[PDB]
Coordinates of C-alpha atoms and ligand atoms in Angstrom, one line a residue:
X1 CA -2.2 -29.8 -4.3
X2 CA 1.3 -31.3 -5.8
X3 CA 2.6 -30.2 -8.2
X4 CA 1.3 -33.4 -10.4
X5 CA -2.0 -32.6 -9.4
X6 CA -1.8 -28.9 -10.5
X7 CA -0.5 -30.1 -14.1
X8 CA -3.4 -32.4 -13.9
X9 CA -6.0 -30.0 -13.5
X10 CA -4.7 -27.0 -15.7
X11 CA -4.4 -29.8 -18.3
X12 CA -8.2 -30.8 -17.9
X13 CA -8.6 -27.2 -18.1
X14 CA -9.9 -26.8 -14.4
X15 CA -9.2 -23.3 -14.3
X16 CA -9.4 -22.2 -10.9
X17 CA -7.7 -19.2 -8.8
X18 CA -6.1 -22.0 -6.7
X19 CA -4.8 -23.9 -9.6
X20 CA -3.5 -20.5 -10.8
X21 CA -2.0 -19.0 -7.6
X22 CA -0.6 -22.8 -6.6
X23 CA 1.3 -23.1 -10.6
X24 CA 3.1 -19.3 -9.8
X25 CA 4.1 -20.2 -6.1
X26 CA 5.4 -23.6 -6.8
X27 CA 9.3 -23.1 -7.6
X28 CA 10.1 -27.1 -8.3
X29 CA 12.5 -27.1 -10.9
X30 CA 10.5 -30.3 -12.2
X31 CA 7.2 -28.5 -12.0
X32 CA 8.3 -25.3 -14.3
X33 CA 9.5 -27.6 -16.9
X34 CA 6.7 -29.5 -16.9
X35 CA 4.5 -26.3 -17.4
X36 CA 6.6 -24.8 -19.9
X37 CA 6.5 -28.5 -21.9
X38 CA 2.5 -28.1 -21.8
X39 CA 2.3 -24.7 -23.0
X40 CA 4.6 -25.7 -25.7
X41 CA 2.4 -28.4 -26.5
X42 CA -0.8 -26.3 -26.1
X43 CA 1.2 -23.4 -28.5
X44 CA 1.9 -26.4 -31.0
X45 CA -1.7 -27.9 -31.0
X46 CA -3.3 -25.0 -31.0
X47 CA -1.5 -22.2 -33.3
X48 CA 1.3 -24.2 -34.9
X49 CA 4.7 -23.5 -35.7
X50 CA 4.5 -20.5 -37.5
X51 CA 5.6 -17.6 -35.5
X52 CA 4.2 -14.2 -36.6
X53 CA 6.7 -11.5 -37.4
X54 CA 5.1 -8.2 -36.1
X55 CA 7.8 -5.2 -37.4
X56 CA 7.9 -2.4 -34.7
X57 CA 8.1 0.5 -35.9
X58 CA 8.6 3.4 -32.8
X59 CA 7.8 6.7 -34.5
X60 CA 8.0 9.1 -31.1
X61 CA 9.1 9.0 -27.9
X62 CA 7.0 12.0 -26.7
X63 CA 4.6 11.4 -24.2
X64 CA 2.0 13.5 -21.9
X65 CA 1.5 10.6 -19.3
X66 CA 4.2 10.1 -16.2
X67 CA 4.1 6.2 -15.7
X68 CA 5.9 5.7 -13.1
X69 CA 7.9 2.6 -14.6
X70 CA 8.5 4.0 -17.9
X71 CA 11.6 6.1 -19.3
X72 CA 9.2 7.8 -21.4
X73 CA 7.4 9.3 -18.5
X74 CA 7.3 12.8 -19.6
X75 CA 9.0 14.1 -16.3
X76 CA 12.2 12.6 -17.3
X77 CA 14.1 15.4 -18.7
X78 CA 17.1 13.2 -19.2
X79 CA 15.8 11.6 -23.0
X80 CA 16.3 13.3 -26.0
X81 CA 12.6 13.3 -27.7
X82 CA 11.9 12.5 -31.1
X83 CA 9.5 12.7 -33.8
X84 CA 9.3 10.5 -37.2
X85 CA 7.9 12.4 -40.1
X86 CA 4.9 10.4 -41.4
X87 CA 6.5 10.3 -45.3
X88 CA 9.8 8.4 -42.6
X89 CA 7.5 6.5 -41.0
X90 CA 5.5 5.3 -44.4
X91 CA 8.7 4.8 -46.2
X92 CA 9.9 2.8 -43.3
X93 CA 7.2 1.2 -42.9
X94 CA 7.6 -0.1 -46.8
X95 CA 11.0 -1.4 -45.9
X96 CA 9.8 -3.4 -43.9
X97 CA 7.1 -4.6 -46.2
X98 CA 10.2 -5.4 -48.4
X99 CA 11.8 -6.9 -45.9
X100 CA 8.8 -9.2 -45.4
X101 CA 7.0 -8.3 -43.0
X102 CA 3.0 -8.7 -43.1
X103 CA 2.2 -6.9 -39.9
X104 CA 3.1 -3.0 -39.3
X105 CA 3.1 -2.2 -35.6
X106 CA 3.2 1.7 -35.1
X107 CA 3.7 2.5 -31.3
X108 CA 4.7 5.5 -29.6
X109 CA 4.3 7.4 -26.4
X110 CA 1.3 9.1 -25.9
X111 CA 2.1 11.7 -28.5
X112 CA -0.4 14.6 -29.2
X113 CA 1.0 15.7 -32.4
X114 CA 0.0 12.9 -34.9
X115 CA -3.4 12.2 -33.0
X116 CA -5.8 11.6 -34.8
X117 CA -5.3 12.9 -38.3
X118 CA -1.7 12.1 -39.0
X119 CA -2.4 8.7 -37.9
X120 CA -5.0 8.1 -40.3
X121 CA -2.9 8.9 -43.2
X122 CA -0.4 7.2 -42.3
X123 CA -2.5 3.7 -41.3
X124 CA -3.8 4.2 -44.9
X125 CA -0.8 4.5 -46.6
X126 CA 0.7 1.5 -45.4
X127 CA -2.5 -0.4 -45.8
X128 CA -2.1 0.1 -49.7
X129 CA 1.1 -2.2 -49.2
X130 CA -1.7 -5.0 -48.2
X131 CA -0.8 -5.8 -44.7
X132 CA -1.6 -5.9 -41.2
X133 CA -1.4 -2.3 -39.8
X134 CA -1.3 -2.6 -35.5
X135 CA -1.8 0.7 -33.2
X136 CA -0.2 0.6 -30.1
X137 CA -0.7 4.9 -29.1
X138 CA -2.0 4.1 -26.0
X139 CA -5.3 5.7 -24.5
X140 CA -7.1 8.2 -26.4
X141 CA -11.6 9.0 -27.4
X142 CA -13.3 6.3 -28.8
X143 CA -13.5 9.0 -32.0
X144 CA -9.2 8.4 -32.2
X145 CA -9.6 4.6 -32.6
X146 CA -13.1 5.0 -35.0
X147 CA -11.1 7.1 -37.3
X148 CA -8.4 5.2 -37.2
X149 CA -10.5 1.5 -37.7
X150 CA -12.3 3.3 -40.7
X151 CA -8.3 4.4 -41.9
X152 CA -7.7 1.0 -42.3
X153 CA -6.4 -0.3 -38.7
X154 CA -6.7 -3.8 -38.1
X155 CA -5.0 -4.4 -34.6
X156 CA -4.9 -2.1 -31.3
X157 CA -2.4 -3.5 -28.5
X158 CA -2.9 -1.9 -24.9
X159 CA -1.3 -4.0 -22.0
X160 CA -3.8 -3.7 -19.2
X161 CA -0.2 -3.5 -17.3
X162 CA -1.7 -4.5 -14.0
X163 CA -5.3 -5.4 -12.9
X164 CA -5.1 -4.5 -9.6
X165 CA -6.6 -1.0 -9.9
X166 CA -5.0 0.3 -6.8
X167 CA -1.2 -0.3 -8.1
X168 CA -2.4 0.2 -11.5
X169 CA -3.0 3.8 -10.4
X170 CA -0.2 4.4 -8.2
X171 CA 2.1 3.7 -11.7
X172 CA -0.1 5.1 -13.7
X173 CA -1.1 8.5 -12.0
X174 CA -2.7 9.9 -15.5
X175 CA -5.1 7.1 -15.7
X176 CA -6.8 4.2 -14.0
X177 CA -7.5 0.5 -14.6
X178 CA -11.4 1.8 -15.2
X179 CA -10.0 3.6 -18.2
X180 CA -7.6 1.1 -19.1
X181 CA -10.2 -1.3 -19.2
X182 CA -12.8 0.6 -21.0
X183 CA -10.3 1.6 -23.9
X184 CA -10.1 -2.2 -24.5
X185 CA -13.7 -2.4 -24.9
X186 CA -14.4 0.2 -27.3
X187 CA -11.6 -1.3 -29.1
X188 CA -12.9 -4.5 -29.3
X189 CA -16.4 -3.0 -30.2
X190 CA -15.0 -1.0 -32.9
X191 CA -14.2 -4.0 -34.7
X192 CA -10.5 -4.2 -33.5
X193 CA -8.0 -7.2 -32.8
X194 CA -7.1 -6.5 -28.8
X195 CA -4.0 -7.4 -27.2
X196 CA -3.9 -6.7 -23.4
X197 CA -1.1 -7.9 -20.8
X198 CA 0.7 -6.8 -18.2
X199 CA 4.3 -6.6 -16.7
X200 CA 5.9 -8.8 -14.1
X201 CA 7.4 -8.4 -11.0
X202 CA 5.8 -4.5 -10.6
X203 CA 7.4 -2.9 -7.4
X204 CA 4.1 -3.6 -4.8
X205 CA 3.2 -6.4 -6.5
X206 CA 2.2 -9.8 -5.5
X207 CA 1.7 -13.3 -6.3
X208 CA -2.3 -12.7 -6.7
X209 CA -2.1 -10.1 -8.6
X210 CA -0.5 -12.3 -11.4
X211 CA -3.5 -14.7 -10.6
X212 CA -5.6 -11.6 -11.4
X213 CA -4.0 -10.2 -14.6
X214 CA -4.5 -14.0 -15.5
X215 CA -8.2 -14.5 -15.1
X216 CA -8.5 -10.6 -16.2
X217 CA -7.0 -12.3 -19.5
X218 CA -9.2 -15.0 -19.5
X219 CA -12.4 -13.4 -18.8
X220 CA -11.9 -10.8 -21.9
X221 CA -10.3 -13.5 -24.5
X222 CA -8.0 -11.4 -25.9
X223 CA -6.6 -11.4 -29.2
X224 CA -3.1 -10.8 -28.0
X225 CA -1.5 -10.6 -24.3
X226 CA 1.9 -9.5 -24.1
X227 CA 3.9 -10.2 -21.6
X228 CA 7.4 -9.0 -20.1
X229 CA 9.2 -8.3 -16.9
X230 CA 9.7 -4.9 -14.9
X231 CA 12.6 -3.6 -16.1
X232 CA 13.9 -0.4 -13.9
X233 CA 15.2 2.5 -15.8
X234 CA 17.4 4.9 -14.1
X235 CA 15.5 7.7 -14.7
X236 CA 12.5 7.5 -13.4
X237 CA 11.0 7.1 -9.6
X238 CA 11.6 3.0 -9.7
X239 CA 14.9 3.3 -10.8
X240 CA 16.1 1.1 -7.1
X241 CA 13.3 -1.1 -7.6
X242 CA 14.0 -4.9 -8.3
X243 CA 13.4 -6.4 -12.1
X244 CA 10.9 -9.0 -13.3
X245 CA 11.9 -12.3 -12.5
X246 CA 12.5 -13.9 -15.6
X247 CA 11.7 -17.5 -14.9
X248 CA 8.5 -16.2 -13.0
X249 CA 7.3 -13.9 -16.2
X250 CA 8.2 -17.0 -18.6
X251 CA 5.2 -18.5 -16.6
X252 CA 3.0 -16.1 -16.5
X253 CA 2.9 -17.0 -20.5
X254 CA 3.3 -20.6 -20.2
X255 CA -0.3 -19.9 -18.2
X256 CA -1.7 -17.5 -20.6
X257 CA -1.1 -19.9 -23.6
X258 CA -2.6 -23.1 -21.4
X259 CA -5.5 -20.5 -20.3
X260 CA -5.8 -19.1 -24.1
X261 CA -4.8 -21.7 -26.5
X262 CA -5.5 -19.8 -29.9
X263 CA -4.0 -16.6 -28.8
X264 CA -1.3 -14.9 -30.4
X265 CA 1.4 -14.2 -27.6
X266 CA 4.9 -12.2 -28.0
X267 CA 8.2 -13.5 -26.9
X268 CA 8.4 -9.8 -25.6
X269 CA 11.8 -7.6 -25.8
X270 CA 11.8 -7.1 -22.5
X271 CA 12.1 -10.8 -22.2
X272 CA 15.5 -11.0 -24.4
X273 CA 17.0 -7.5 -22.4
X274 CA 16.8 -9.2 -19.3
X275 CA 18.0 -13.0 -20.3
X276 CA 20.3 -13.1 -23.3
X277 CA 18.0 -15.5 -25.6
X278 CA 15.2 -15.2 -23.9
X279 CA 13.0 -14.6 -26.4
X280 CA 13.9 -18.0 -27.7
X281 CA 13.6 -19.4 -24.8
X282 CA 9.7 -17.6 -24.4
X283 CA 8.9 -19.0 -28.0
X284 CA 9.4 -22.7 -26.7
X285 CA 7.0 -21.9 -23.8
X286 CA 4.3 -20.7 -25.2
X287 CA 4.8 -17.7 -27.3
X288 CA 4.5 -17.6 -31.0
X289 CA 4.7 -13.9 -32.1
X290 CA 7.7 -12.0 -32.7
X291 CA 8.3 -8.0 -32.9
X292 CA 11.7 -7.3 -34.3
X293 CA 12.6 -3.6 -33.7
X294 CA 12.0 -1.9 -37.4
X295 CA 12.8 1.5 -35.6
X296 CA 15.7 3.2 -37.7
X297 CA 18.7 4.6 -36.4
X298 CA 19.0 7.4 -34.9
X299 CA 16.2 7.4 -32.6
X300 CA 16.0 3.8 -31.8
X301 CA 18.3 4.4 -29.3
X302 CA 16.3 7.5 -27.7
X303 CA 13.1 4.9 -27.4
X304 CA 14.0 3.3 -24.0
X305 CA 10.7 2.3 -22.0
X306 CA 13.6 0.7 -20.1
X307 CA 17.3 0.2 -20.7
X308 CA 19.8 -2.1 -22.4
X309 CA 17.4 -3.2 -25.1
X310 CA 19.4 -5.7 -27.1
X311 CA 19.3 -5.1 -30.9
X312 CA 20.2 -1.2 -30.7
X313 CA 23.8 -1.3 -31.8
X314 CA 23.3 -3.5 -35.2
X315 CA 22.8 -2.1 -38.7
X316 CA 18.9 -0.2 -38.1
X317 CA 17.6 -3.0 -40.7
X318 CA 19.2 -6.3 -38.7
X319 CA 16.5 -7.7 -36.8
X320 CA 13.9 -9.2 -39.3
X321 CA 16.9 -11.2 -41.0
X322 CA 17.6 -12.2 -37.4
X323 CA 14.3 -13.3 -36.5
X324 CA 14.3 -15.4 -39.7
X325 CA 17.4 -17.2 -38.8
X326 CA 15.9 -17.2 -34.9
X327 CA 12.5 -19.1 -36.4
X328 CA 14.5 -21.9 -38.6
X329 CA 17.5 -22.3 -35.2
X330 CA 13.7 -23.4 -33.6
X331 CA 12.9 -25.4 -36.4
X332 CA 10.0 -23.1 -36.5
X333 CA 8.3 -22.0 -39.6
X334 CA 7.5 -18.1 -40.5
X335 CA 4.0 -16.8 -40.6
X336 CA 2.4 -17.4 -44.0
X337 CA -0.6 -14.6 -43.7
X338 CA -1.0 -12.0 -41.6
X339 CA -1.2 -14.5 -38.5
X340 CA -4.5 -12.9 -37.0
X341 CA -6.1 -14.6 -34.3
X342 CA -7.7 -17.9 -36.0
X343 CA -10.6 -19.2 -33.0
X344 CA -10.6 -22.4 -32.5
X345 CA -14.3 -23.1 -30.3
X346 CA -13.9 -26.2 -28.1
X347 CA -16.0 -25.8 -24.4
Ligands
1N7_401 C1 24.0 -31.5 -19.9 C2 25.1 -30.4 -19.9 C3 26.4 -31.1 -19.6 C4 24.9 -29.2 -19.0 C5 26.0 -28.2 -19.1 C6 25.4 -26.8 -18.9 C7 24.0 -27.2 -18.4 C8 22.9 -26.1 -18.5 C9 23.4 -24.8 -17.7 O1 23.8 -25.1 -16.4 C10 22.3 -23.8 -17.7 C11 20.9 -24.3 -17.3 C12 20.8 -24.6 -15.8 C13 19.4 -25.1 -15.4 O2 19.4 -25.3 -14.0 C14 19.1 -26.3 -16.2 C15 19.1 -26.0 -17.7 C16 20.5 -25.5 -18.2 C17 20.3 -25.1 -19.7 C18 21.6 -26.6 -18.1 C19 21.2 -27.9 -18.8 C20 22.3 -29.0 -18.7 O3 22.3 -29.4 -17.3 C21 23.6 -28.4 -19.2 C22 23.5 -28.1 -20.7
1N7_402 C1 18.7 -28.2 -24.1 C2 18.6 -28.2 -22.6 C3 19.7 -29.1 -22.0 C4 19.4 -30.6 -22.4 C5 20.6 -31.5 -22.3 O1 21.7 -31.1 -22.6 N1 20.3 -32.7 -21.9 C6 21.4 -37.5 -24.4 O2 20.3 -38.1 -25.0 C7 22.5 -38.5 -24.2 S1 23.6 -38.1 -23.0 O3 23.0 -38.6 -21.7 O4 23.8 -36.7 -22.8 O5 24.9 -38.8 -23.2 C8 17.2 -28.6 -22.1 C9 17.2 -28.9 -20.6 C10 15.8 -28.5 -20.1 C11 15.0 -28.0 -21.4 C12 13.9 -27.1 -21.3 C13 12.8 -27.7 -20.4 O6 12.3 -29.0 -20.9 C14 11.6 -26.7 -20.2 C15 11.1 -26.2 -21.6 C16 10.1 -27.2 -22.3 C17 9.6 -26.8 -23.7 O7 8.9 -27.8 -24.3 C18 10.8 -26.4 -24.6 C19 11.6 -25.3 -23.9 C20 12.2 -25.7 -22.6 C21 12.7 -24.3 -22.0 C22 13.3 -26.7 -22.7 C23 14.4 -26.4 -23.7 C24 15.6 -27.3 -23.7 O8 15.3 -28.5 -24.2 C25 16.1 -27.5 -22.3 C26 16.6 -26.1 -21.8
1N7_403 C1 21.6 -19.2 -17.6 C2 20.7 -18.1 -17.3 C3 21.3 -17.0 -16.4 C4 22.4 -16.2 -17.1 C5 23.1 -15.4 -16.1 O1 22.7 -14.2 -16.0 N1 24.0 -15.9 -15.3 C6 19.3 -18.6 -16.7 C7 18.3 -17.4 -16.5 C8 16.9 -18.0 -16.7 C9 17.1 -19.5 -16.8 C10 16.0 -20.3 -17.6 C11 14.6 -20.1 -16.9 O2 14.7 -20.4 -15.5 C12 13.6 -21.0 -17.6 C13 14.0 -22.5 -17.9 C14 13.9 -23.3 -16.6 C15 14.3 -24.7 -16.8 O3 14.2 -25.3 -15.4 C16 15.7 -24.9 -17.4 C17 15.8 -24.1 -18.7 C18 15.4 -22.6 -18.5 C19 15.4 -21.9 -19.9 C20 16.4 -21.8 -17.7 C21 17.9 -21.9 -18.1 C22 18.9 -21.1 -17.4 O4 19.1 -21.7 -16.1 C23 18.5 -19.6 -17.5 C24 18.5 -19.1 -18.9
1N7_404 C1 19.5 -14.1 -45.6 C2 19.7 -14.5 -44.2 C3 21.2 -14.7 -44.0 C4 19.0 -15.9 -43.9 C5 19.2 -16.4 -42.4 C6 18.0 -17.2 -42.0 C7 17.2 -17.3 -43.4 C8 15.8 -17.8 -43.4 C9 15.8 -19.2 -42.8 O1 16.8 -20.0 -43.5 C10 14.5 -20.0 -43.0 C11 14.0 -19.9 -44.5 C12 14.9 -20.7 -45.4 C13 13.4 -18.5 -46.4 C14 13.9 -18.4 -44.9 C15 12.8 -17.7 -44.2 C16 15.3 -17.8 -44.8 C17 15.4 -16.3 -45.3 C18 16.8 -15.9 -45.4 O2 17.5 -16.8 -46.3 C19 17.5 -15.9 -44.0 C20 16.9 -14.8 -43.2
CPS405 C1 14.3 -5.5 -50.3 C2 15.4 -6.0 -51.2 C3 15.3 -5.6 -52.7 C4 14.1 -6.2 -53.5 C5 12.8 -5.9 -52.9 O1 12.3 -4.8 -52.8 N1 12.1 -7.0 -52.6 C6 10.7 -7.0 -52.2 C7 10.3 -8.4 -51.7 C8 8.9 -8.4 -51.3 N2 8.5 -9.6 -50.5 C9 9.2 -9.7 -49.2 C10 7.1 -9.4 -50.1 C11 8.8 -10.9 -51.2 C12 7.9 -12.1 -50.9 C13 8.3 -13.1 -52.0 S1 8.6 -14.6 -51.4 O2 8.9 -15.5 -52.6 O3 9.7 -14.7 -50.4 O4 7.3 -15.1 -50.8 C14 15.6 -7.5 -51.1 C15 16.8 -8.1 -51.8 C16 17.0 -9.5 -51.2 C17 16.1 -9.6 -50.1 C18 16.5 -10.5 -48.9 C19 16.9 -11.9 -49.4 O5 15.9 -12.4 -50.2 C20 17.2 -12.8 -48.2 C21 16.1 -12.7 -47.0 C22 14.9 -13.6 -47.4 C23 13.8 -13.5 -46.4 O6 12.7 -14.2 -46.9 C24 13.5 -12.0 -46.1 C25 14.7 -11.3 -45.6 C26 15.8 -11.3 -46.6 C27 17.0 -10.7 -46.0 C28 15.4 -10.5 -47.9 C29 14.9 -9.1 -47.5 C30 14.6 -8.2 -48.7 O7 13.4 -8.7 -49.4 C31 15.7 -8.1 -49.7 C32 16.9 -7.5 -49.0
SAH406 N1 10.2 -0.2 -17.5 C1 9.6 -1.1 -18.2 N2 9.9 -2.4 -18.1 C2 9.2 -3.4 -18.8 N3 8.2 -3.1 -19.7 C3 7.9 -1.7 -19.8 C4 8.5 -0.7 -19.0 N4 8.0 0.5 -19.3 C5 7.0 0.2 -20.2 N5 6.9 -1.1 -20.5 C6 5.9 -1.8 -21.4 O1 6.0 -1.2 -22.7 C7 4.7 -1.1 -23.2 C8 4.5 -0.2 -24.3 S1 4.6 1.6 -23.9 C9 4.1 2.2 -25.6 C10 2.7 2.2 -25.9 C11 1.7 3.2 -25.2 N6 2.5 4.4 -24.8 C12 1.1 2.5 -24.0 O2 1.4 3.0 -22.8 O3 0.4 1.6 -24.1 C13 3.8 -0.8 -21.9 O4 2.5 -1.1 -22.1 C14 4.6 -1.5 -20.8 O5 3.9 -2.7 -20.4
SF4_407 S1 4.0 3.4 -20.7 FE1 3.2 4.4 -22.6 S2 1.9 6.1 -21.7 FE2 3.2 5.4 -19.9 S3 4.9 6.9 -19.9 FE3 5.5 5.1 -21.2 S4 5.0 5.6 -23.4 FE4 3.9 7.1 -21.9
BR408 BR1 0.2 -7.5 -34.0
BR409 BR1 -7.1 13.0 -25.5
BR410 BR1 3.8 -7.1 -27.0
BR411 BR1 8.7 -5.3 -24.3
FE412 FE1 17.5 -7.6 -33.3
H2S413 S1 16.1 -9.5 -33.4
H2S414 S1 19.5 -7.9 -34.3

């Protein structure tokens, strides 16, 4: 089909693995546009103008799993570790409370030490301020994320990183899609808002594997998908590998909005490392979340799933005063509430 006819159908909402696999192939400069102008659309219909300021707050960089893509991988010898106290991380966390914020991400690597206990506390501590509280730890027992749901945690984000459960284990040599998969599950059973995702441009993989993580997507409804590109970091085995195309990622979540209109999608960080503005450029093509890095100084700098993050050089308190002015440059609107998922049932 043209690419007319493929605009057509996803905007009858003819969702087919054609339709999908034909929108990534097609590189017609008309076509992307096009696409990006409906998720836009879709994005505006659908979940407003509001985007959602998510503050990120990276409390460790330890980790016991070896991802392969990931300059956390515990094999890399080359990263000075760190740890946040939990009174650091709570007082931080208020900061950004005052700052504005009205969702708390905590994220980490896979870090023993706080699990489960410290966690706990430290969820129900900044759930006193009367926010959002999000868990991004990674994969632990269905016990972790019960204790930490009852603690107060409202959000869980696990990027399914790649549904194709052959590559996913070859990067992922601690774990497997199964796993992956199944910690999203419990999550969602426990009562949690789920965000999956996955990254772009993954050395080994290919156009239908994008078509998968997309009807993967679609099939579980998430919550939240975020999205970014492969970004190779020196120090680990893909180091020589190629990066995430950008234009290519930027339609994986033009897709993902048009394929889940009331989900709440990041313009990621890896999005803005690898294009200058392009998180801006993602949040006028379908995103409408935001994670400014709440991370103080100095270990913001030691967190680097990847290198070059933009924002590590300002004053450790810069970026939710620059996503503000990044919302209103849009002629966007900030998030009201907490901006959880709000359904909107068509067929
Ligand atoms: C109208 C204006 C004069 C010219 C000068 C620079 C041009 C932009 C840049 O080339 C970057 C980019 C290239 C893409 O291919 C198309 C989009 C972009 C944004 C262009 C749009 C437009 O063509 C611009 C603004
Ligand atoms: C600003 C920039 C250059 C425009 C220009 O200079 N002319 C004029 O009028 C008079 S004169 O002819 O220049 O004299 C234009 C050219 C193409 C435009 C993007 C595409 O649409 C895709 C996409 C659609 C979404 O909905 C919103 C985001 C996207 C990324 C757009 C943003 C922006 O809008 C772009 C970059
Ligand atoms: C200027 C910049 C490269 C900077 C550099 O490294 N040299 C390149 C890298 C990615 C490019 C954008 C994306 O393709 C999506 C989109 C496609 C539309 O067709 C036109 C607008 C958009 C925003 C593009 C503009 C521009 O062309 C970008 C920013
Ligand atoms: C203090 C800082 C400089 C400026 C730059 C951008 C400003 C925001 C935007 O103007 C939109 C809106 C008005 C109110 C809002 C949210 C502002 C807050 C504040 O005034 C900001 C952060
Ligand atoms: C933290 C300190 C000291 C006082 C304090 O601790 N302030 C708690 C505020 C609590 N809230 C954010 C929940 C207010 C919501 C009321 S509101 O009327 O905005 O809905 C106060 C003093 C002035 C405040 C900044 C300015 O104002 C400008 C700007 C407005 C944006 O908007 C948010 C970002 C920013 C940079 C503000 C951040 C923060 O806040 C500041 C630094
Ligand atoms: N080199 C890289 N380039 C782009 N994104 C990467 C990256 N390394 C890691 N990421 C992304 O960063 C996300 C958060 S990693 C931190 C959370 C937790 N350890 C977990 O594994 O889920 C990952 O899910 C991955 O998709
Ligand atoms: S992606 Fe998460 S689990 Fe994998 S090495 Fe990095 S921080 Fe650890
Ligand atoms: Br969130
Ligand atoms: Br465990
Ligand atoms: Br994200
Ligand atoms: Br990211
Ligand atoms: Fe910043
Ligand atoms: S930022
Ligand atoms: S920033």
């Amino acid at each position: 089909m043209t690419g007319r006819e493929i605009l057509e159908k996803l905007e009858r909402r003819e969702f087919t693995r054609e339709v999908l696999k034909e929108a990534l192939s097609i590189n017609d400069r008309g076509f992307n546009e096009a696409l990006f102008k409906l998720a836009d659309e879709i994005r505006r219909k659908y979940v407003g103008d509001e985007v959602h300021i998510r503050a990120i707050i990276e409390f460790s960089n330890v980790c016991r799993k070896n991802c392969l893509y990931c300059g956390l991988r515990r094999d890399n010898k080359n990263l000075k570790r760190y740890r946040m106290t939990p009174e650091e991380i709570v007082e931080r966390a208020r900061l950004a409370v005052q700052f504005g914020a009205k969702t708390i991400v905590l994220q980490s690597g896979e870090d023993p030490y706080x699990m489960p206990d410290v966690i706990s506390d430290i969820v129900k501590e900044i759930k006193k301020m009367g926010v959002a509280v999000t868990l991004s730890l990674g994969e632990w027992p269905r016990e972790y994320y019960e204790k930490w749901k009852e603690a107060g945690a409202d959000r869980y984000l696990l990027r399914h990183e790649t549904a194709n459960p052959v590559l996913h284990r070859k990067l992922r040599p601690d774990t497997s899609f199964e796993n992956r998969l199944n910690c999203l599950l419990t999550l969602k059973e426990l009562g949690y808002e789920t965000g999956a995702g996955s990254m772009v441009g993954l050395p080994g993989q290919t156009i239908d594997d994008l078509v998968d993580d997309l009807l993967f997507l679609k099939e579980h409804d998430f919550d939240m998908v975020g999205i970014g590109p492969f970004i190779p970091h020196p120090d680990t085995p893909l180091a020589n590998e190629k990066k995430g195309d950008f234009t290519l990622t930027l339609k994986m979540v033009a897709l993902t909005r048009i394929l889940l209109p009331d989900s709440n999608i990041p313009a990621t960080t890896a999005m803005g490392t690898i294009v200058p503005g392009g998180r801006e450029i993602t949040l006028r093509c379908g995103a409408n979340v935001i994670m400014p890095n709440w991370t103080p100084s100095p270990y913001r700098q030691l967190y680097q799933l990847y290198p070059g993050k933009i924002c590590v050089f300002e004053k450790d308190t810069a970026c939710i005063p620059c996503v503000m002015k990044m919302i209103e440059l849009l002629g966007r609107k900030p998030g009201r509430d907490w901006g959880g998922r709000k359904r909107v049932f068509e067929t």
